[PDB]
Write a protein that binds this ligand. Structure first.
Ligand SMILES: N=C(N)c1ccc(C(F)(F)F)cc1
Length: 328
């Protein structure tokens, strides 16, 4: 089997992407944030504290003939945002690919940032199932459940810049990228799609060969890299500075940003400068927020949407997982 679904930015900055997901019988379609950095499929629901729902579409398990309470199971996750609740199993379909008996984690509580974002009805985790938070019986991700049935045990992320893109399951669309896909090793020890970039360049500058361990994370907006790398980038933008009050690098909105290149083995992925602009820090400001930020304090580097959207990315879930990157 295969599936293919379009993923759409939630706003004009590409702060996140939503993908329609069919849950239950008859189908209830919710728009979920596909997150390769976590492993829970959770939804706003009829059980969510009423004051914490503001415009989201909810899953109502009592209206699904295939829903079954997973007795005794609870979940709780943090991302400063958080959510928690209980668990059903139900039929879940993404882009024509159906999994029966998928754990659908129903939110009883969500933090303010979720409530405040009307466009995201929940999360669909695509990291390794070892990170799943359901207790006392850990549950599998949608991909883990589907894998055996897929034509090939892979999914791909093809995120758009200020435009829709695609998540495919079970096949690689050879028309969706240019050149070849370069594959690179993955460590699953922390539960993430963790890999090592071979270095970087800023603008038209020379490539610096240096190992940068990090995660391929569709659920993080920005590109978080070591302070040395990030300083080298922003030093090429007149007037850019790190602002403790704002919480990262800002730059004059009048700037033209340089590109940023990262290495995948001997291959190179170029992030255009425009992708690194996250717009005014507050409405009407001439100070703009940067899309490349320091990972110092996080504990891990994060190749979030800013980086991933510049590539066609293969999440290869074969017995020894790997990641593939192509230009597009
Ligand atoms: N995409 C996510 N859900 C996510 C959240 C937190 C981290 C960490 F704290 F480890 F940095 C990494 C990834």
């Amino acid at each position: 089997s295969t599936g293919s679904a379009t993923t759409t930015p939630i706003d004009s900055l590409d702060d996140a992407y939503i993908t329609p997901v069919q849950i239950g019988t008859p189908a209830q379609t919710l728009n979920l944030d596909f997150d390769t950095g976590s492993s829970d499929l959770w939804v706003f629901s009829s059980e969510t504290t009423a004051s914490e729902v503001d415009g989201q579409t909810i899953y109502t398990p009592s209206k699904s003939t295939t829903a079954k309470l997973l007795s005794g199971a609870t979940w709780s996750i943090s991302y400063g945002s958080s959510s928690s609740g209980d668990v059903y199993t139900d039929t879940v379909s993404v882009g024509g690919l159906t999994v029966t008996g998928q754990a659908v984690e129903s939110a009883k509580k969500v933090s303010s940032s979720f409530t405040e974002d009307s466009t995201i009805d929940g999360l669909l985790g695509l990291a390794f199932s070892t990170l799943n938070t359901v207790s006392p019986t850990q549950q599998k991700t949608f991909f883990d459940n589907a894998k055996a049935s897929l034509d090939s045990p892979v999914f791909t992320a093809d995120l758009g810049y200020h435009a829709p893109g695609t998540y495919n399951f079970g096949f690689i669309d050879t028309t969706a990228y240019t050149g070849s896909i370069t594959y690179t090793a993955v460590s699953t020890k922390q539960g993430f799609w963790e890999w090592t970039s071979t270095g970087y360049a800023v603008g038209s500058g020379t490539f610096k060969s240096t190992s940068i361990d990090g995660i391929a994370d569709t659920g993080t907006t920005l590109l978080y890299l070591p302070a040395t790398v990030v300083s080298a980038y922003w030093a090429q933008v007149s007037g850019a500075k790190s602002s403790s009050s704002v919480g990262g690098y800002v730059f004059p909105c009048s700037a033209t940003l340089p590109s940023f290149t990262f290495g995948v083995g001997s291959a190179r992925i170029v992030i255009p400068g425009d992708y690194i602009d996250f717009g005014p820090i507050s409405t009407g400001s001439s100070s703009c927020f940067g899309g490349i930020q320091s990972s110092a304090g996080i504990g891990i580097n994060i190749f979030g949407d800013v980086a991933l959207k510049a590539a066609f990315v293969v999440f290869n879930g074969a017995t020894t997982p790997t990641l593939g990157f192509a230009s597009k």
